[PDB]
Ligand binder design. Sequence first.
Ligand SMILES: C=C(C)[C@]12C[C@@H](C)[C@@]34O[C@](Cc5ccccc5)(O[C@@H]1[C@@H]3C=C(COC(=O)Cc1ccc(O)c(OC)c1)C[C@]1(O)C(=O)C(C)=C[C@@H]41)O2
Ligand SMILES: CCCCCCCCCCCCC(=O)O[C@@H](COC(=O)CCC)COP(=O)(O)O[C@H]1[C@H](O)[C@@H](O)[C@@H](O)[C@@H](O)[C@@H]1O
Ligand code: NA
Lengths: 79, 537, 80, 67, 80
Amino acid sequence: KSLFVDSYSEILFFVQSLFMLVSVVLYFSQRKEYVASMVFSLAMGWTNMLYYTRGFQQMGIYAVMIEKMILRDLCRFMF
Amino acid sequence: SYTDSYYKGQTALHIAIERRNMTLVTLLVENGADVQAAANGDFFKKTKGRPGFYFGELPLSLAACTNQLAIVKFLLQNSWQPADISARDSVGNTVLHALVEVADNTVDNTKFVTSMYNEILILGAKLHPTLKLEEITNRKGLTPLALAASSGKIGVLAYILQREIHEPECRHLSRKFTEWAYGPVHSSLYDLSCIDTCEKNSVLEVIAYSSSETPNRHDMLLVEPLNRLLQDKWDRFVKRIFYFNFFVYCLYMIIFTAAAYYRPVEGLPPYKLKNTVGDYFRVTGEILSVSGGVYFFFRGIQYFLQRRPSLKSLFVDSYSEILFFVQSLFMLVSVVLYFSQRKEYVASMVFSLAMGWTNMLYYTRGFQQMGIYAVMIEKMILRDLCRFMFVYLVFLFGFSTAVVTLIEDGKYNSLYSTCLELFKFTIGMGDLEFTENYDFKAVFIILLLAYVILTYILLLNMLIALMGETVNKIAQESKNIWKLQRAITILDTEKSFLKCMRKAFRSGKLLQVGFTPDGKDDYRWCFRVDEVNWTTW
Amino acid sequence: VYLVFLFGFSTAVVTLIEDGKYNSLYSTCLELFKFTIGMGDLEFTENYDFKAVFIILLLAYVILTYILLLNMLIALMGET
Amino acid sequence: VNKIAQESKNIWKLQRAITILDTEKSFLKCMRKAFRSGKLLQVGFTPDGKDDYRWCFRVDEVNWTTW
Amino acid sequence: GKIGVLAYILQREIHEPECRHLSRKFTEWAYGPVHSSLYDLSCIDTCEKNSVLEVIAYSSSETPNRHDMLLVEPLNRLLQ
Ligand SMILES: C=C(C)[C@]12C[C@@H](C)[C@@]34O[C@](Cc5ccccc5)(O[C@@H]1[C@@H]3C=C(COC(=O)Cc1ccc(O)c(OC)c1)C[C@]1(O)C(=O)C(C)=C[C@@H]41)O2
Ligand SMILES: CCCCCCCCCCCCC(=O)O[C@@H](COC(=O)CCC)COP(=O)(O)O[C@H]1[C@H](O)[C@@H](O)[C@@H](O)[C@@H](O)[C@@H]1O
Ligand code: NA
C-alpha cells in the first residue's frame, strides 16, 4: 500500500525498465512484438524526464500537481 | 586599537558603545578617546558573502545604528571631545547614510531608524544651523534620500518625503507643510526638491531606472507625493505626447503593412521601379518602412548605451526595448537580403511585420485597464506558458517518437509529420486514425489515447487552473508594474521633450516658511494636495 | 488584444503567401480565425516559399492566441 | 490547485531532500567531503574537564529587538 | 512525525551552568543586531543507523507531518 500511494516515480522508472527488458526478450525470441514493448518504454522514458523537474521550485511544484491531479481528479472523471 | 586586517580600527570606544555601557563610554571619552576613530576592518564592511556588520565605521554612527540616543547626544555635545556630525567614513557615508543602510523595511527596524534619523536632524540644526546634512553625498554621489530610493528602503523614503516637524527652529527641516486649514479640509504642500528634477539622482529617476534587483522598486511609487506627482505630469504634459507617439506608430505599421502586402512576385530582387502611381506609392512605403526600422535600431542602441545592462539585467528586465530592437534587426536583415538579390528577404520582412503588430501592445500602457491587462499577459507568458510549454513539449516529443517508431514505411514515418499530426490534437483537429501503416493497431490506438488524455484532458485544463491561480495573485503586482511602466514613459518623454519646454517642471514655486536659519526666505517648488478629515478638529 | 494579434499574423502570413487561392487579407484572416474555434487547418496552403517560416508563424499565432489568450480569458472571467 | 499550492511547496522540498540523500549514499567516488559543517568546539566543558567537538553548522541571524 | 518535539530538540538551548552541554544550539559570538549560532548536527547529517534526515526522507508516507518536518531551521538550511 505504501508501494503505490507514494514513491510513484521509482515505480514508473522500474516499469520503463520492465518494458525495455520484455522488448529484449521478444527481440531474441524472434517475435516482431518487441516493437510494441519498445515504444512503450520509449514514450515512458521521455515522460519520466519530468522526474528531473524536482530541484526546481516552479517546475517541481508543477509536476507535483500533475501527480496529484492524476491520482484524484483524472481517475474520478475517467470513471 | 586592533591592527589585524579583520578587526582593524576597532577600539575600546567601539566596544563600550557596542556593550551599551554609558559609563564606560563616558570614561573613555574623558580619558582622551578618539571619537572619530574609524573601524575599517573587513568585518565592519558590507561584504555580503562574509559575516560582518556595516554601521558607517564611526562611533557616532555606531550609536545611531544601535538605537542608543543617549550616547548619540553625549557624543555630539560632550565637553571633552564633541563628535563631527558631518563626518564621512571610507565610503563617504555620513551617519544618515548609515541609518539608511541599516534599514530593512521591517516595522520595528523602520520605527527606530526613522526616529533616530529625525533626532539627528534636530540636533544637527541646533548645533550647526548652517549645515545641511541631507545634501551630503557619499562616494557614489548619493544623498541619503537618493541612497534610500536606490536601495529600495521604502519605509525610510516614505518617512522622509512627508516629514513634518512641529517645533521652532526645525520647521525649515520639514518637507510636508500645511498651508491653510479651514474646517475638516486643509491644503498641504510637499517639498519636491530633488524628486522632480535635480543634478543627478532624482528620486523618480532613481526608482525608474533601478537595476531590477532593488527590493521594493514596484512599491516605492505608492508613496503619496510620488503617485500624485506622476499623475499630474501625465495629465498635464505627457498624455498628449504619448498619444501622438502611438498614432505615429500606427501610421508606421499601416504603411509597412501596405508596402509589404503589395510586394511584387517576380523573382530575384531588387525590382525595377515602374513608372506608375501604385509603384511610386509602394516604393515610398518601402523607404518609410526601412526608415522606421533604422530609427528603432538606433533607439535600441541608445537605450543600451545609456543604461549599460550587465547581460542579465539586459534580459530579465526591459523586454519592450528588446522586442522593438529585434523588430528593427529583422527589418535591416531584410534590407540586406533584398539588395543581395535573395528572395529570403521576405522571410525576414514578415517576421518584422508580425513583431511590428504585436509590439503595438507596448502602447497599452497609458490606459489603466489595458495596461494592467498587458502586464498580466506578460506575466502569464513568463510564468505559466513557459512552464507549460516545457512539459507539453516533453510529452509531445515522447509520444511522437513512440508513434513514428511504431509506423513503418508510411506516408508519415517522420518526426516532423508525426509531431505535427499529434500537435493537431491540441488545437482540436486531431485525426485519431491518420494512418494504418503499422502492425499492432492496439498499440497505436493505446498510444494515441494515452497522449490525448495526458495532454488534451489533463494538461490543458491544468493550465487553465494554474492561470486562474496566477491572476488571483498578481492583481496588485500588475497594477504596481503598470504604474512603474507609465512612470518610465513619463521620464523618457520629459528627457526627450523635443522643444526645450519648461512647463514640464510642475508644482509652482511657493514660499514655505520664508524664515530659514538666517534671515533669507525659502521658495521650494511645492506640490499642493488637499485633504479632508472628520476627526481631530 | 486578440484582434491585434490576429491582424498582425494575418498580414504576415498573407505577405508570405504569393499567387495562391488565399493571397488576400480577408481569406487569411478568416483562415486564422478558424484556429480560435478549433477548426484551424495548419496546412491550408502551399503557395509560398520558406515552409519553415509559414509554420513558425502559425505555431507562434496558435501559442499566443489559442493557448495563452483564450485560457487567460477563462481565468480572468473566473476572477471577475 | 487552490487547495494544494502549499502542500506542493512542501513536497518539492521533500523530494529535493530525497535526491540529496540518494546522491550522498551513492557517491561513486569515495568522497568524504560530503560530511559538511566542520568540527568546532562548542562548549569546551563536558561533565568532566574534557572539551566537546560536535560538528556544528553555522547560521547567522539578525534581530533589531531585544538589545 | 512528532514535529513539535523535534522542533524543540533540534534548537535546544539551556542557559545555566552544568547544563550548557545539553544544548544543541549554541551562540558563538554576538555583536549588536547580528549574532552567529551553531547547531549541533550530531545524528542529523550522519550517524550509525537513524539519521534524522534519513528517517524523515525515507518516511513510510503515513507519518503525519513528513512534508513539514524539513521546515525546521537547521534541517532546511543544511539541505540547502
Ligand atoms: C500510474 C501508473 C504507474 C501509470 C504508468 C504508465 C502506464 C502511464 O499510464 C498510467 C495509467 C494511465 C494511462 C493513460 C492515461 C493516464 C493514465 O499512468 C501512469 C503513467 C502515466 C504517466 C504520467 O506521466 C507522469 O506522471 C510524469 C511524471 C510525473 C511525476 C513524477 O514524479 C514522475 O517520475 C518519473 C514522472 C505517463 C505514462 O507512463 C506514459 O508515458 C505511458 C505510455 C503511459 C503512462 O499508469
Ligand atoms: C514572432 C512574434 C513573437 C512575439 C513574442 C512576444 C509576444 C508578446 C508581445 C507583447 C508586447 C508587450 C511588450 O512590448 O513588452 C512587454 C513584455 O512582454 C513580454 O513578456 C515579452 C516576453 C518575450 C512589456 O515589456 P516591459 O518593458 O514593460 O518590461 C517590464 C519593465 O519595463 C518594467 O519596468 C518591469 O521591470 C517589468 O518587470 C518588466 O516586465
Ligand atoms: Na475541432
